[PDB]
Write a protein that binds this ligand. Structure first.
Ligand SMILES: *[C@@H]1O[C@H](CO)[C@@H](O[C@@H]2O[C@H](CO)[C@@H](O[C@@H]3O[C@H](CO)[C@@H](O)[C@H](O)[C@@H]3O)[C@H](O)[C@H]2NC(C)=O)[C@H](O)[C@H]1NC(C)=O
Ligand SMILES: *[C@@H]1O[C@H](CO)[C@@H](O[C@@H]2O[C@H](CO)[C@@H](O[C@@H]3O[C@H](CO)[C@@H](O)[C@H](O)[C@@H]3O)[C@H](O)[C@H]2NC(C)=O)[C@H](O)[C@H]1NC(C)=O
Ligand SMILES: *[C@@H]1O[C@H](CO)[C@@H](O[C@@H]2O[C@H](CO)[C@@H](O[C@@H]3O[C@H](CO)[C@@H](O)[C@H](O)[C@@H]3O)[C@H](O)[C@H]2NC(C)=O)[C@H](O)[C@H]1NC(C)=O
Ligand SMILES: CC(C)Cc1ccc([C@H](C)C(=O)O)cc1
Ligand SMILES: CC(C)Cc1ccc([C@H](C)C(=O)O)cc1
Ligand SMILES: CC(C)Cc1ccc([C@H](C)C(=O)O)cc1
Ligand SMILES: *[C@@H]1O[C@H](CO)[C@@H](O)[C@H](O)[C@H]1NC(C)=O
Ligand SMILES: *[C@@H]1O[C@H](CO)[C@@H](O)[C@H](O)[C@H]1NC(C)=O
Ligand SMILES: *[C@@H]1O[C@H](CO)[C@@H](O)[C@H](O)[C@H]1NC(C)=O
Ligand SMILES: *[C@@H]1O[C@H](CO)[C@@H](O)[C@H](O)[C@H]1NC(C)=O
Ligand SMILES: *[C@@H]1O[C@H](CO)[C@@H](O)[C@H](O)[C@H]1NC(C)=O
Ligand SMILES: *[C@@H]1O[C@H](CO)[C@@H](O)[C@H](O)[C@H]1NC(C)=O
Ligand SMILES: *[C@@H]1O[C@H](CO)[C@@H](O)[C@H](O)[C@H]1NC(C)=O
Ligand SMILES: *[C@@H]1O[C@H](CO)[C@@H](O)[C@H](O)[C@H]1NC(C)=O
Ligand SMILES: *[C@@H]1O[C@H](CO)[C@@H](O)[C@H](O)[C@H]1NC(C)=O
Ligand SMILES: *[C@@H]1O[C@H](CO)[C@@H](O)[C@H](O)[C@H]1NC(C)=O
Ligand SMILES: *[C@@H]1O[C@H](CO)[C@@H](O)[C@H](O)[C@H]1NC(C)=O
Ligand SMILES: *[C@@H]1O[C@H](CO)[C@@H](O)[C@H](O)[C@H]1NC(C)=O
Lengths: 131, 257, 131, 257, 131, 257
């Protein structure tokens, strides 16, 4: 599909917060005893609406809600942390879950260099055919 | 299936892991992201009266929590301390490890009472309550939250397009008849001085009105409760946040004209 | 192995219940506030013993128990939700965890179309050998 | 390793992810399933006396929970409220988010007492207690369960072979000496009227006997306890569920002949 | 990198404990009611410093701590069990996350047998060229 | 990124899943391992005075737990029962399913008091507290632990190189001023008989001293407290564990020369 923003408004800027997974290399700050409290682990950034990505993102999050809620209704986990890892697995299973038929539409193996390796080396059997 | 955003032809698109082509590359779990987006940014009314009308109590539905890795700085968050008339708590205590939303310019702390006909409070429009990197389907007692929704993305490997510190201000409210058709709200100046709340009052107007009351000496100077009203003729600011006087007396009601 | 049902009896029919992961598209039913309570999220079905699959399934579940219990003894997770995802990963690692040696017994890459693509195109070098 | 079912040559087979051949296709996590199957369906005795003899108390073993995504409709489930002689609880309260098994034709609710020599109650034959999509190694207080076991499958991508509403009825029992060699059971008609339980009594016989007692007026019409006994000569129904009178007096014992 | 043990000392022996994932086949011991208590589920072993692996392991665990702590600061999970499964996924995504260009440095597909299958079978077209 | 050990050229090496070459084979999740290693094995001082100086209280940091699948047999573990002067608990109760470290030759059980200026106790050097296959960033009340760190490995598929039962002894200590510059420690012989602790006292020296006190009859034979001191001239054992008298009187202080 495509993303059709259909909200009353769009804040075109995303002033965001997040954590850094490897962000306190300075001295002893990585040690929990010395490091920041819960309130001071965030990094900030600002992102503008190049390629309409912010207004798209807002619409995408809105449209994700129905599916997400229905998934949460169906799970017995109290806190769900596995959605992105499960997407990662399903990515791999789509591509690599069966036999990969080379040159078929559902197999991501490029022989491009292996084509011209053999077209190059027929000219040491038909080219080198010396009587 | 849960939608998954991806950047194709200089545009965000919905697809999923099943709909991709071999050119699309997921070389690491780092490329996967969950982002929380605030209803604010879609243009919803953020005033306490309008905001609370979106929530409601319901029994039989077990609460659910999903995490999200990054969020948006909010103008408006909310923190609820609601009790029944009998003094029993209407909302559950925050579960272990659920802290409040980390960036709020204004936290609207509403204390009060209501019938609370249901075990848990849900979002009537299906949105989530965003806490610190955890989105719940329900409201926790005394824990700050932003209303919002969650997106999942496959970011690209490198670069994704063509080409002030943190201050939080708490704003206190008294409420009666919470989560009903006849809810009443009072903005709190001190423990004895209040203002009848209306939907048109913005956060900056409330802080300015508060500032004026303290510096004009219009606080209750008795043991009793003083409730100011602002008559219709005083405007306060239909524009979103990112694009933007005398006192006389008549509990103790009063008018600011 | 094969599944040898060795139970005193077998109910040949499986009258089952389950949740649907995306099952309440009608109006506002997906919203938790409006949707069904815990008791009304289930779908039902009936499955008969074609190919002996129900009687097999009963035996399979019985035989799974020892391994499952021993796995639960060894885990410190209080509630285990990761068994099927871990099977998914191990499926992928079996096939794709090493180098895929083409035409070997442990590599699921079919060159069938890539064989006859090159047998077709030798006849624009030995067939087209014009003096 | 944990076995994994798969459909090959029009038959279910045990294998695992290591034993598959390239022809076998796992193109999505949707193909993976965990199913709970009820011991009922293997022909076990489902009467309360026979069923409770399969459970027992034990200390030093930490409880464990695994989830399962689909289950089987049960005829017989059980719900236990057991205390020691001193009135202390024998079973733990249901953990957060563990609800009872969702489809039971008859819930056998047993209330009573016993020594309960151990911290938790386990299945002596190694089976699980099936709750709402969670299987536990132990019994929770006052929470309905079916005895059962769990299977894991790789379903095929498409089609897997060659070619009434929900009513639940609760049945109450009193127990003494629970989980011992000399356990005694009474079927409850009302708070003062009981029947001495036996293994041969089916659920439908109990509901029919109950129906007869109320409509023949054979309930205790005093302040005291009345315990009926059915003498050996009255049959009730050795067939599985899916393939299928006068009263005189002698607490207060009595005979139904 | 390489592992440079830089600790004051090294116990060259690793007297270890662990659980066995499928370890109580004897009779009824797999059944929790009959099996060992929490204290008696462990197996032991002793491992000496062949190839400097024990002294390396000690240093590796020391050096892992900063990254691990920073990861734990950033997660909202109270108990983290998914680190090794996530490594497994990232292993697969590194190798198989894009299109596999054959004979490129980032594609683990060996054509070795498929090379000499075709060099063998040109000698039923250039070898068998009978006039 | 979190480092991942792997065996290349008859040597352990740091790399990660991103840095591997196609020759490296991960054919199963069984090849992945997390191992806990004890600070002991790096040569740290294991005596109670030296060990406790590595821990400290801190607020605002949420505790975190990670699991590990295999560990090392410890000589020294610790078990803390600390209270404030007002009798309130300094450490939280063990969360559900966090049992103590499974192999300790000596468990140093320290009971006592201190200011405890912070919500949780952390490791000042950044190490973890190792419990039964769970590593925490904090110390739990009355739960045995070894200080340590965690490694992750990809083991090879087959063979990885070129080419006594379990006894635990508990040792009790009294403490005052715990987690401060002026902490005082007493080794406990019985409820009335104590020894002033010093860093140079090894576990085997304490058990030998205890053995001597009981068999020389040097225990308090009154209602009152008796605190022995060992004067500087009596040595006890700077070597690691894996490579290795008269009494007179002066509460009631005393000297063992
Ligand atoms: C995703 O975005 C859409 C569009 O902004 C949101 O749609 C909103 O949906 C609710 C119904 O759930 C609408 O409220 C209803 O309004 C009618 C009158 O128009 C009233 O009779 C109903 O009782 C109810 O209040 C709301 O008008 C509609 N908004 C717009 C601008 O059309 C939707 O809520 C978003 N989803 C999430 C999960 O946030
Ligand atoms: C899987 O299915 C099998 C077959 O139905 C079940 O086997 C049962 O195993 C138990 C032992 O755990 C047997 O009970 C024992 O019976 C002997 C006398 O025969 C008695 O002396 C022992 O004290 C004990 O009670 C039981 O007879 C046996 N059933 C059959 C029909 O042979 C097994 O329990 C199933 N596994 C699970 C986890 O449900
Ligand atoms: C990993 O191994 C290294 C080396 O054994 C450990 O290094 C230790 O780091 C701490 C700082 O966190 C050092 O303590 C400091 O000592 C100085 C005086 O030298 C003092 O002024 C400071 O106040 C502080 O106490 C310690 O000396 C150092 N050890 C060595 C032998 O150099 C490190 O702790 C290990 N990491 C983990 C997580 O266990
Ligand atoms: C569509 C895309 C541009 C959204 C988006 C939002 C937040 C972030 C931050 C930097 C993160 O890494 O979480 C990246 C990308
Ligand atoms: C062997 C196989 C036929 C068992 C089986 C059991 C239940 C289900 C339901 C429809 C589900 O999707 O959970 C499918 C397949
Ligand atoms: C580097 C390597 C030799 C470390 C190591 C440590 C412990 C174990 C045990 C047998 C386990 O399987 O957990 C294996 C390997
Ligand atoms: C809710 O209150 C309004 C007035 O605010 C009133 O008109 C209406 O009758 C009430 N609705 C119900 C359902 O009681
Ligand atoms: C107002 O009242 C609250 C309790 O209702 C109290 O905690 C607070 O100190 C009071 N503040 C003032 C300024 O009186
Ligand atoms: C109201 O004004 C007083 C005086 O300036 C100030 O202390 C108080 O914080 C103000 N209230 C709010 C909500 O900012
Ligand atoms: C006392 O009370 C009134 C408000 O009730 C206020 O306007 C007045 O200024 C107060 N007195 C002083 C001296 O401020
Ligand atoms: C259990 O009770 C039976 C009678 O029901 C009796 O024969 C037996 O002695 C008892 N067993 C034990 C071990 O006490
Ligand atoms: C029977 O007794 C129980 C409590 O033991 C009580 O809750 C219930 O109301 C009683 N029912 C009748 C019909 O007396
Ligand atoms: C017993 O019979 C009465 C009267 O018909 C009925 O109300 C009651 O529910 C019956 N008991 C059971 C267990 O169904
Ligand atoms: C009173 O008691 C007996 C049972 O004890 C019963 O059979 C009798 O019918 C009862 N009386 C009436 C009028 O039903
Ligand atoms: C800590 O105690 C020592 C003596 O043991 C003393 O010299 C020092 O002043 C104290 N430090 C602080 C910061 O109070
Ligand atoms: C020592 O005191 C503790 C309580 O402080 C008590 O539990 C224990 O029994 C006592 N032991 C002896 C030998 O007196
Ligand atoms: C001290 O000695 C006595 C007598 O031999 C013994 O019972 C006690 O366990 C010893 N203390 C320790 C800590 O081993
Ligand atoms: C009584 O007390 C002292 C220690 O205070 C001890 O040395 C002495 O031997 C004790 N008496 C006996 C008979 O052991």
């Amino acid at each position: 599909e495509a993303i059709v923003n259909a909200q009353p408004k769009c804040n075109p800027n995303l002033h965001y917060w997040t954590t850094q997974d490897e962000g306190a290399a300075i001295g002893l700050a990585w040690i929990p005893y010395f490091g920041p409290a819960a309130e001071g682990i965030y990094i900030e950034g600002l992102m503008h609406n190049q390629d309409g990505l912010i207004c798209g993102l807002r619409q995408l999050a809105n449209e994700t809600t129905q599916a997400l809620q229905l998934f949460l209704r169906a799970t017995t986990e109290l806190r769900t942390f596995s959605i992105l890892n499960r997407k990662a697995i399903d990515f791999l299973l789509q591509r690599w879950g069966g036999t990969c038929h080379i040159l078929g539409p559902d197999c991501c193996i490029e022989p491009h260099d292996w084509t011209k390796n053999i077209t190059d080396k027929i000219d040491q059997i038909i080219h080198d055919f010396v009587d | 299936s849960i939608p998954l955003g991806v950047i194709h032809n200089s545009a965000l698109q919905v697809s999923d892991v099943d709909k991709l082509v071999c050119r699309d590359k997921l070389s690491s779990t780092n490329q996967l992201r969950s982002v929380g987006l605030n209803l604010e940014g879609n243009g919803v009314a953020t005033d306490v009266p309008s905001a609370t009308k979106r929530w409601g109590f319901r029994s039989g539905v077990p609460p659910k929590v999903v995490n999200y890795e990054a969020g948006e700085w909010a103008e408006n968050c909310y923190n609820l301390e609601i009790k029944k008339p009998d003094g029993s708590e209407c909302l559950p205590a925050a579960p272990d490890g659920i802290r409040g939303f980390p960036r709020c310019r204004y936290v609207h702390k509403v204390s009060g009472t209501g019938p609370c006909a249901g075990d848990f409070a849900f979002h009537k429009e299906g949105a989530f309550f965003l806490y610190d990197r955890l989105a719940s389907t329900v409201i926790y007692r005394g824990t700050t939250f932003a209303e919002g929704v969650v997106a999942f993305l496959i970011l690209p490997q490198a670069k994704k397009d063509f080409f002030s510190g943190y201050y939080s201000t708490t704003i206190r409210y008294q409420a009666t008849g919470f989560g009903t058709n006849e809810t009443e709200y009072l903005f709190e100046v001190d423990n004895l001085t209040y203002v009848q709340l209306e939907s048109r009052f913005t956060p900056q107007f409330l802080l300015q009105l508060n500032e004026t009351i303290y510096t004009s000496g219009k606080r209750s100077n008795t043991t009793g409760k003083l409730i100011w009203k602002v008559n219709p003729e005083i405007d306060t600011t239909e524009w979103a946040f990112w694009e933007t006087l005398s006192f006389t007396v008549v509990x103790x009601x009063x008018x600011x004209x």
